[PDB]
Enzyme design. Structure first.
Site, PDB file in Angstrom:
ATOM      1  N   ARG A   1      38.876  48.231  36.592  1.00  0.00           N
ATOM      2  CA  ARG A   1      40.083  48.223  37.392  1.00  0.00           C
ATOM      3  C   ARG A   1      40.954  49.362  36.999  1.00  0.00           C
ATOM      4  O   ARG A   1      41.074  49.687  35.815  1.00  0.00           O
ATOM      5  CB  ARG A   1      40.842  46.930  37.222  1.00  0.00           C
ATOM      6  CG  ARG A   1      40.046  45.699  37.561  1.00  0.00           C
ATOM      7  CD  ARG A   1      39.690  45.651  38.987  1.00  0.00           C
ATOM      8  NE  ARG A   1      40.835  45.462  39.828  1.00  0.00           N
ATOM      9  CZ  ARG A   1      41.344  44.263  40.158  1.00  0.00           C
ATOM     10  NH1 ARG A   1      40.808  43.161  39.689  1.00  0.00           N
ATOM     11  NH2 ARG A   1      42.369  44.198  40.980  1.00  0.00           N
TER      12      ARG A   1
ATOM     13  N   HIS B   1      41.780  46.678  49.030  1.00  0.00           N
ATOM     14  CA  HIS B   1      40.888  45.906  48.188  1.00  0.00           C
ATOM     15  C   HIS B   1      40.849  46.375  46.742  1.00  0.00           C
ATOM     16  O   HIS B   1      39.782  46.715  46.232  1.00  0.00           O
ATOM     17  CB  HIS B   1      39.496  45.966  48.749  1.00  0.00           C
ATOM     18  CG  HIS B   1      39.042  47.351  48.971  1.00  0.00           C
ATOM     19  ND1 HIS B   1      39.189  47.972  50.186  1.00  0.00           N
ATOM     20  CD2 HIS B   1      38.507  48.253  48.137  1.00  0.00           C
ATOM     21  CE1 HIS B   1      38.733  49.202  50.089  1.00  0.00           C
ATOM     22  NE2 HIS B   1      38.318  49.402  48.862  1.00  0.00           N
ATOM     23  N   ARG B   2      41.998  46.377  46.061  1.00  0.00           N
ATOM     24  CA  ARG B   2      42.044  46.776  44.634  1.00  0.00           C
ATOM     25  C   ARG B   2      41.221  45.856  43.723  1.00  0.00           C
ATOM     26  O   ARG B   2      40.970  46.191  42.565  1.00  0.00           O
ATOM     27  CB  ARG B   2      43.475  46.800  44.112  1.00  0.00           C
ATOM     28  CG  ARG B   2      44.151  45.445  44.046  1.00  0.00           C
ATOM     29  CD  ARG B   2      45.544  45.541  43.541  1.00  0.00           C
ATOM     30  NE  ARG B   2      46.200  44.240  43.531  1.00  0.00           N
ATOM     31  CZ  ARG B   2      47.444  44.007  43.071  1.00  0.00           C
ATOM     32  NH1 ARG B   2      48.160  44.988  42.571  1.00  0.00           N
ATOM     33  NH2 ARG B   2      47.943  42.784  43.120  1.00  0.00           N
ATOM     34  N   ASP B   3      40.790  44.711  44.255  1.00  0.00           N
ATOM     35  CA  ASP B   3      40.039  43.729  43.515  1.00  0.00           C
ATOM     36  C   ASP B   3      38.519  43.995  43.575  1.00  0.00           C
ATOM     37  O   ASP B   3      37.730  43.235  43.010  1.00  0.00           O
ATOM     38  CB  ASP B   3      40.361  42.346  44.072  1.00  0.00           C
ATOM     39  CG  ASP B   3      41.852  41.986  43.926  1.00  0.00           C
ATOM     40  OD1 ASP B   3      42.431  42.252  42.892  1.00  0.00           O
ATOM     41  OD2 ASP B   3      42.405  41.481  44.879  1.00  0.00           O
ATOM     42  N   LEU B   4      38.122  45.081  44.254  1.00  0.00           N
ATOM     43  CA  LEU B   4      36.720  45.468  44.351  1.00  0.00           C
ATOM     44  C   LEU B   4      36.155  45.749  42.955  1.00  0.00           C
ATOM     45  O   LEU B   4      36.667  46.607  42.236  1.00  0.00           O
ATOM     46  CB  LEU B   4      36.595  46.740  45.214  1.00  0.00           C
ATOM     47  CG  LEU B   4      35.176  47.180  45.610  1.00  0.00           C
ATOM     48  CD1 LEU B   4      34.611  46.192  46.618  1.00  0.00           C
ATOM     49  CD2 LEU B   4      35.215  48.593  46.186  1.00  0.00           C
TER      50      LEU B   4
END
Ligand SMILES: Nc1ncnc2c1ncn2[C@@H]1O[C@H](COP(=O)(O)OP(=O)(O)OP(=O)(O)O)[C@@H](O)[C@H]1O
Ligand SMILES: Nc1ncnc2c1ncn2[C@@H]1O[C@H](COP(=O)(O)OP(=O)(O)OP(=O)(O)O)[C@@H](O)[C@H]1O
Ligand SMILES: [Mg+2]
Ligand SMILES: [Mg+2]
Lengths: 630, 131, 209, 638
Positions: C95, C52-55
């Site tokens: 990010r 989940h790098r989009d967290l």
């Protein structure tokens, strides 16, 4: 040499004691085990008679007879099976962890329609959990009649039997322990029978010393027949009804029924039933969750619906009968509970399909929904993965409807070409929200709203954030967007200025009672109204949550949404107030009026009133003024 | 006597494997997605390995035909020997694709059980008791 | 009369928490708890290989009991309904560089994201703020330090080496009430090179928390 | 005929598979059983060395070590215990249903203080749940070193001393299955042993590859981890209560559950009867956020046998209303089944529960003496107390003395009902109380006006759960409890004033009649009551049914739409204050013209405002406000 080889040993002297002390928990299961074995033998006959019908010359009847004897305090079980030879008694019956049922099944690898149980080879010894001594007498077609006697004292004896003849099969004599006489009770026996043997393929009878006190052949002991074992396409509705009534004991038959079966590593058949009415104890917190039962080879294993099905579906009655599961040494428990979770998933899918087709049948769906919509709504709240499917089943009253509910999709089909959201209002009653000021302008715009009148709707709507690409919006919250005529918009801005200082005055008057004072065209017939910020509890949510016995009061610090006073510029009162502000913004009577209006609005807007007594006191004073009292 | 066949069942909505700091409402869905992606990638791998195997199989099959032709050819045995080596390489390639496919078979054997592998929809029949 | 229960779901978004939170200098001890609530969650997520790098901050739930709950594990299962039109274009100060470098998800990626969030918590304000991915790094580098093309990841889409080297700015002094130990943990999480960062477990088990 | 005698036989080839395949469901018991055996062997030494010190000539230190070997996919358990002889390997280890713990059971007549864990002679074979092969190397002092070896293939072998120095106890070598590699992970090991070896008398250590900085020393960290910490928490209940102090005891609590603060209160419980056991009960200083999240499986009270974790079924161990007390129950006399995952004869737990509850109540009584901390306790768990009173009718006799309320005389100080009783007026033969939404609501209610004028004390109740409590608690210290919100509030008063009330009833007789007609189908009965002072009237509840507050709770909280009950429970009347100026006027107005609609409308207004003051929601609040707006417009000349 450097290594010696030995075969594993087993001290039977203690092994036996483990078997009859630690392997089992419940003791009434001794009947289950004995009956199970009886039915296996009856299947053995059946199979053998297919190849040689003359084997039935020595008995053409397949059944199990239970004959209690309180005079001796013993229990006789008569099994009309094949029976065992002398060798079988000393090779199979007297051997731990070994069964001829398995061996027979190995012979049946040639091909058969036989369904037998007994892969452990120890169940017999469970008889000693209850009985002090067990005697087994048998007559095989190819051997003489023998008696087998043992008290599980490390040994057993065999001698040819004399007196009463056995055509075939075997009798089990349970010399019941002195403190186990409860198993001589009719009720207790029937309890166990219903507990583990309702679906035994062969007739089981119970003999009771009744009118003339003679052994009465209770043939109906297990008269209930399996349905899922039959071909679905050959089963009538009348038959499904009979089963359902037998299963549930509900004099009224089911609303709907569905077959379900899977093939592969997991294989089973199942019947699920939708009841026509909800039970009065449907939501009882401590209610045993046994609506759907798990059977293996038609033998009751467990009924733990806590895992087997979703709580929001915990009203569907039914039977799941699998072919091959990894049962524990005690058949009461199933290993690898993840299996049950797998089964659950498959059940859910089919229940939802049934609901869909039930929805096609409008006339009966509405009956279903009426009774179980709370469960569907619960599902919206609980289940994050099937919510979408469940949302299609939802039905509400709306502005253009009468007393007929309608789906969200139907609402969508009636949306305006410029409408981007679903308008709704929640409350205590249909009439309450029908007469709410919040939907008056909405109606003036020709818009339809959704009426939500159950307290649980607050939990449901919380999750219904978007439906079919359409957003949802409450008319009770700030920021309600309704068609904005640019001409009107200008006029609204002019009005904002017109009543600007008035709003400021009102705010000064009620600085600690309202967060913001402003005008809004959401109102029609009301001078004003209290609305709730989009963040936090609504008036309805607040009221409901403040009625929760086990609620933590400190959570209000995150949920006390701000109140805003909407003003409706078109009222004589509002205009008067503006004029009065111009005449004298410091006029006490006017200020008192402002406060009155607020509390009136606050109360009528569905919000908790800080002090009903004080509010009414003011009213009483006004009454007195009208009366000329003082 | 052996229930090891059910020792590897993967349930994406397994509510008994959760965490206090994690919102399972989306976690379960993450699991679902991951499972799907794993099946997708697995299937692609298998298909590509099978494709490669069949291509080399056909290539060596055509070379074997040609080996017979070169043997017959008056002096084509010089080319025959060259082709034999090339054909062996094509066969070895096929073999290695098959070895990889054998590893894929091993992967299938090691594959966790789920609702898409444990069973199929053998039968379904609804009925509403209307009337 | 029978008894039955029903419970309310918590929608207290971290962003809302921060909007309700006090000015720069947010109680370090409260944050320490929230940090270890977050990191504990990560250990679970790493054990379950959750990608989940989009967290982002808004995917973090802060409950009324001070519990950090994580949700929305990557674009693959989120925003199935109305969403932002600039989920990526929006300033990605939360990010990891590895996101900005267009690589993938990893333990260091995740922690880099929340590292900035932890600083945001102390400041009640976004730690960094650039325009493009390269510009975002140009703001990141001002705190963590920057080297030439000799300490950059292989999988980089940005013109590595075209980022003029510079020193770090003691996180302790930059971020309000950032106790040195936390400054070290954060700086490690913020460090550009993902292999010079600290794992969720290591940070979680650090005496600072 | 001739009677032939036979001994029972056993098909070991199948039996063995039953042991492995059907006796256990949770493979975590793998380490549990292995460790348990190690601890037994250590106890064997303890006893032997106790009576004969020379037994330790070949080793004094007693401990259990676990060494994982990922490079082999094997595990090593090092048991420094007494060890086994060749004969023992053949006889004991290689035999099903055979255990040398019974040898010590019989041998230890002097060793009364020795307690071995379990006795089935089967658990050893559970290693094969996750292991492909097991090798046991051992050297009892009275024999040499041997290596027992088997893959559970129907046989086993024994090999001679291979030179790997083992002069005491045994080395258990576990060759793990291809798919059981999770047990090579530190985390996983710790998870398991934490739940099973928590209270092993001997220290358990792990030898783990230590996570470390690259060995470039420049920097370097230690190569291996010695995880002795696994047994940092020792049994407390095993010691003498009088010799136990908070300096250690509180450390146990914070170790028991992850809570960095001392407990609120505790109670050591020693049972020396048939079900001999000891227990530690703990009360947290703060309630948990999930306290009432009953969807979650309970685990506050854990059941240990011989200091080994067995069950955590609070559902049987305690009653729901005590589901906040955390603790340990430890017995050495329990009949566990073959899996050791479940206690046989649940009736045992029923007895145990009753004994626990008794002492929990005793603790609460003890707390009642410490007013300061009692207050803290009460506030934190007042709901649980109240739930118990509702559900557990048996113990209301004790639970009802734990109740604390704010009253009209105590004000901001919360007091006991017994204190209320001790200060009751000689005419005050009943407890007067009122329930409502909040303190200041009921404190300013018309219902308590006369009551205060008569010098009576009122118990204020504010929670939904209080509304449930009064449905069960009827009497206290011999006196009944009376709600001032119900009709027929017989306050002690001067008969002559009652006569004045009867005279007033005659005076306003026609008024009441008229009002009833006006409020036909709005109110069940219009009458007069002197419980009112400043108000002209009041909506009251009947002697039965739901109160306004009760309806507020039930109609909103219940998930069941029991409209039948709602119908039956929806009762209410209207009382009139004969001394109020408005009332006086209404009389005069009725006399002037009973058909004066304006008066009738006034009555309606008063009614609706009366409903408001009594907590009854209006059937159409909008029309109420509409009337108000009309009156406003009138005053404004609109
Ligand atoms: N009614 C019967 N007729 C003939 N043989 C029987 C009968 N009942 C039991 N037996 C014999 O008893 C033997 C002992 O088997 P037992 O029933 O104890 O194992 P099982 O019950 O088949 O296995 P499980 O323990 O799984 O039920 C079997 O070999 C079977 O032949
Ligand atoms: N590490 C060990 N050291 C010494 N003896 C052991 C060891 N492990 C197993 N044994 C032998 O096994 C016997 C019993 O072990 P096992 O666990 O199989 O039965 P138990 O421990 O008595 O009860 P359970 O069978 O329930 O564990 C012991 O008496 C001993 O002879
Ligand atoms: Mg049998
Ligand atoms: Mg043992």
């Amino acid at each position: 040499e450097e290594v010696e080889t030995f075969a594993f040993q087993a001290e039977i002297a203690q092994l036996m004691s483990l078997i009859i002390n630690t392997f089992y928990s419940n003791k009434e299961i001794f009947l289950r085990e004995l009956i199970s074995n009886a039915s296996d033998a009856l299947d053995k006959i059946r199979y053998e008679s297919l190849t040689d019908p003359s084997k039935l010359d020595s008995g053409k009847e397949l059944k199990i007879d239970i004959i209690p004897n309180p005079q001796e305090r013993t229990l006789t079980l008569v099994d009309t099976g094949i029976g065992m030879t002398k060798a079988d008694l000393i090779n199979n019956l007297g051997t731990i962890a070994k069964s001829g049922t398995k061996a027979f099944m190995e012979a049946l690898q040639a091909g058969a329609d036989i369904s037998m149980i007994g892969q452990f080879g120890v169940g017999f010894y469970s008889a000693y959990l209850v009985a002090e001594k067990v005697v087994v007498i048998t007559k095989h077609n190819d051997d003489e009649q023998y008696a087998w006697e043992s008290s599980a004292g490390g040994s057993f004896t065999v001698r040819a039997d004399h007196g009463e003849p056995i055509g075939r099969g075997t009798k089990v004599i349970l010399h019941l322990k002195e403190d186990q006489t409860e198993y001589l009770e009719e009720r207790r026996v029937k309890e166990v029978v219903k507990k583990h043997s309702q679906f035994i393929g062969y007739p089981i009878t119970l003999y009771l010393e009744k009118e003339k006190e003679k052994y009465i052949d209770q043939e109906e002991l297990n008269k209930t027949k399996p349905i899922w074992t039959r071909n679905p396409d050959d089963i009538t509705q009348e038959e499904y009804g009979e089963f359902y009534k037998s299963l549930t004991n509900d004099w009224e038959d089911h609303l709907a029924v569905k077959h379900f079966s899977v093939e592969g590593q997991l294989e089973f058949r199942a019947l699920l039933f939708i009841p026509r009415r909800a039970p009065f104890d449907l939501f009882e917190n401590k209610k045993k969750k046994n609506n759907i039962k798990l059977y293996v080879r038609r033998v009751f294993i467990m009924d733990s619906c806590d895992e087997l099905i979703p709580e929001y579906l915990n009203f569907i009655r039914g039977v799941v009968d699998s072919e091959d599961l990894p049962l524990n040494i005690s058949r009461e428990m199933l290993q690898q509970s993840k299996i049950l979770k797998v089964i659950r998933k498959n059940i859910v899918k089919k229940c939802l399909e049934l609901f869909s087709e039930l929805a096609e049948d409008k006339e009966n769906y509405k009956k279903f929904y009426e009774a179980f919509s709370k469960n569907l709504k619960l599902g919206i709240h609980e289940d994050s993965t099937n919510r979408r499917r469940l949302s299609e089943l939802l039905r509400y009253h709306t502005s253009q409807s009468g007393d007929e509910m309608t789906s969200l999709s139907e609402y969508v089909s009636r949306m305006k070409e410029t409408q981007k959201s679903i308008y709704y209002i929640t409350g205590e009653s249909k009439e309450q929200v029908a007469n709410s000021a919040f939907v008056e302008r909405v109606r003036k715009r020709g818009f339809e709203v959704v009426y939500m009148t159950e307290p649980i709707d607050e939990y449901c709507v919380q999750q219904l954030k978007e439906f079919d690409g359409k957003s949802l919006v409450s008319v009770t919250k700030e920021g309600l967007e309704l068609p904005e005529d640019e001409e009107e918009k200008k006029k609204m801005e002019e009005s904002k200025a017109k009543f600007e200082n008035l709003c400021k005055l009102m705010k000064e008057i009620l600085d600690k009672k309202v967060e913001k004072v402003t005008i809004s065209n959401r109102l029609v017939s009301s001078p004003c109204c209290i609305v709730t910020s989009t963040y936090g509890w609504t008036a309805n949510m607040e009221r409901i949550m403040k009625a929760q016995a086990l609620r933590d009061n400190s959570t209000m610090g995150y949920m006390m949404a701000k109140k805003h006073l909407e003003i409706n510029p078109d009222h004589p009162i509002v205009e008067t107030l503006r004029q009065k502000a111009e005449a004298d913004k410091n006029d006490k009577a006017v200020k008192d009026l402002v406060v009155l209006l607020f509390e009136t609005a606050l109360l009528s807007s569905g919000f908790s009133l800080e002090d009903p007594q004080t509010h009414s006191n003011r009213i009483y004073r006004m009454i007195k003024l009208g009366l000329g009292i003082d | 006597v052996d229930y090891s066949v059910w020792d590897h069942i993967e349930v994406s909505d397994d509510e008994d494997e959760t965490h206090p700091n994690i919102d399972t409402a989306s976690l379960f869905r993450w699991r679902h997605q991951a499972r799907v992606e794993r099946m997708e990638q697995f299937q692609k791998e298998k298909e590509e390995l099978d494709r490669g195997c069949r291509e080399c199989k056909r290539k060596v099959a055509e070379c074997q035909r040609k080996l017979k032709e070169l043997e017959v050819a008056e002096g084509g045995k010089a080319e025959l020997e060259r082709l034999q080596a090339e054909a062996q390489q094509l066969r070895k390639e096929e073999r290695s694709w098959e070895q990889k496919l054998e590893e894929m078979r091993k992967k299938e054997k090691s594959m966790p059980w789920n609702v898409d592998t444990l069973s199929k929809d053998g039968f379904s029949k609804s009925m509403v008791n209307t009337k | 009369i029978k008894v039955t229960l029903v419970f309310e779901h918590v929608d207290q978004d971290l962003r809302t928490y921060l909007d309700k939170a006090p000015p720069p200098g947010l109680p370090a001890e409260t944050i320490k708890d929230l940090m270890r609530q977050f990191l504990r969650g990560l250990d679970f997520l790493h054990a379950n290989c959750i990608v989940h790098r989009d967290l982002k901050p808004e995917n973090i739930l802060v409950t009324s009991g001070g519990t950090v709950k994580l949700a929305d594990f990557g674009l693959a299962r989120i925003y199935s309904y109305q969403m932002a039109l600039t989920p990526v274009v929006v300033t990605l100060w939360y990010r990891a560089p590895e996101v900005l470098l267009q690589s993938t998800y990893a333990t260091p990626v995740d922690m880099w994201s929340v590292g900035c969030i932890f600083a945001e918590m102390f400041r009640r304000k976004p730690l960094f703020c650039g325009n493009s991915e390269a510009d975002q790094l140009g703001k990141i580098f001002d705190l963590i330090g920057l080297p030439p093309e000799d300490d950059w990841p292989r999988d980089v889409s940005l013109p590595r080496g075209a980022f003029p080297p510079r020193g770090p700015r003691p996180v302790q002094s930059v971020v309000p009430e950032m106790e040195e130990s936390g400054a070290q943990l954060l700086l490690e999480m913020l460090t550009f090179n993902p292999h010079k960062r600290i794992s969720a477990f290591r940070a979680l088990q650090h005496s600072y928390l």
